[PDB]
Amino acid sequence: AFLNSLFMDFTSENELELFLKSLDEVWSEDLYSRLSAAGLIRHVISKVWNEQHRISMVFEYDSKEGYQKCQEIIDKEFGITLKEKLKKFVFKIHNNRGVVVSEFIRS
Amino acid sequence: TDETAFLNSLFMDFTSENELELFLKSLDEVWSEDLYSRLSAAGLIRHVISKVWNKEQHRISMVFEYDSKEGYQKCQEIIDKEFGITLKEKLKKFVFKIHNNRGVVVSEFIRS
C-alpha cells in the first residue's frame, strides 16, 4: 500500500561501511518488533554502486496508518533516542514516500 | 521465502503532473503479467511502482528486486527483446531522467 524509498548519502566510504557494520545497533531487534507490530512489512538495505557513498533503504507498509504509526516510532528512534549515538555519522537523507500504484510479487 | 540479493531503487521526474499521470496510465502496456512471468522465472522477485508524494517534483519510484545480479542482467536481456521501435517512440513523447540506484542487499527484514 505505501512505500518509503529512501537514500542515505555519507561524506566518506569509511563512514558508510562503519554504519553498515553497525546496523544491529541502529536497526535493532527491539525496534523491528515494534515496527512489525505497527504495520511494517519489509525493510531492505542495500549498497548503491557508484562517486556517491550511498545506502538505499526501502520500507513497505500494509497501509498509510501503518506508515504513519511506524514513522512516528522511527522519527523518535533516531531523532531523539539514538540522536547522540548517530552524531558520529554525517549523512544526508532523501526520502521518497508514496502510495503503491502496482506491485508484482513472484510465487 | 525469496531472498533479494540485488536491487534497483530507481526514480523518474516529469516536467508536469499530466505527463506523470499519462506515463502511469501507460504502464500496463509495458508491465504485462506475461512479461512478469518470464522475468520472474529469470530472477525478478518483486517490482513495486509508487507515486511519490512530493510538492516540489512529479515523481514516480520503482523498486525492482532480484534473487541475484545475474538475474538482473537476464531480465535486462528479456526487456530488450520485449520492446522495440513502438515503445522507443512512445518514450519520445515524454521527458524525464531515470535516476538508478543499483546494488547488493546487505540486510533484509521480512515480517513474521
Side-chain angles (χ1 to χ4, degrees), chain B residues 50 52 54 56-65:
Chain B
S50 157
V52 177
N54 182 332
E56 300 171 316
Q57 312 287 339
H58 305 282
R59 186 167 291 182
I60 296 301
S61 63
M62 289 184 174
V63 177
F64 297 79
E65 299 186 32

Side-chain angles (χ1 to χ4, degrees), chain A residues 3 5 7 20 23 32 36 39-48 54 56 58 60 62 95-107, chain B residues 2 4 7 9 11 24 36 40-41 43-50 52 59 61 63 65 67 101-111:
Chain A
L3 185 151
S5 31
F7 302 105
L20 291 183
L23 284 177
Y32 281 120
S36 176
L40 181 64
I41 310 295
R42 299 172 87 259
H43 183 223
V44 198
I45 299 179
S46 49
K47 270 175 166 167
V48 175
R54 171 170 285 194
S56 169
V58 179
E60 293 184 54
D62 57 353
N95 293 287
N96 289 293
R97 311 172 188 289
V99 50
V100 170
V101 298
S102 81
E103 180 174 41
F104 166 71
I105 298 172
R106 191 196 219 180
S107 293
Chain B
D2 280 313
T4 299
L7 177 159
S9 178
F11 66 92
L24 283 186
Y36 279 139
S40 86
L44 185 70
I45 298 173
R46 190 186 290 254
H47 180 214
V48 196
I49 305 174
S50 157
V52 177
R59 186 167 291 182
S61 63
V63 177
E65 299 186 32
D67 62 10
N101 298 284
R102 307 180 209 98
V104 200
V105 171
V106 186
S107 189
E108 192 181 359
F109 173 73
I110 318 175
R111 176 162 72 179

Side-chain angles (χ1 to χ4, degrees), chain A residues 30-32 34-48 50 52-63 66-68 70-71 73-86 88-94:
Chain A
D30 201 308
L31 184 64
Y32 281 120
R34 287 188 277 107
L35 296 171
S36 176
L40 181 64
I41 310 295
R42 299 172 87 259
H43 183 223
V44 198
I45 299 179
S46 49
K47 270 175 166 167
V48 175
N50 217 130
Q52 287 300 309
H53 308 297
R54 171 170 285 194
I55 289 173
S56 169
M57 296 189 181
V58 179
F59 297 83
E60 293 184 54
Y61 308 95
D62 57 353
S63 57
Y67 157 71
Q68 284 165 25
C70 289
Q71 188 60 56
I73 293 170
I74 290 175
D75 280 352
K76 183 157 190 171
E77 194 67 36
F78 307 122
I80 306 171
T81 306
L82 300 175
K83 156 72 173 192
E84 215 73 7
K85 304 258 284 208
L86 294 165
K88 64 174 65 59
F89 301 100
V90 174
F91 56 85
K92 181 161 180 172
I93 303 287
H94 297 271

Side-chain angles (χ1 to χ4, degrees), chain B residues 18-27 29-34:
Chain B
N18 281 354
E19 191 163 317
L20 174 154
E21 295 180 54
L22 179 63
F23 186 94
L24 283 186
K25 277 181 174 298
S26 314
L27 290 174
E29 295 165 23
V30 181
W31 306 108
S32 62
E33 315 298 343
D34 182 28

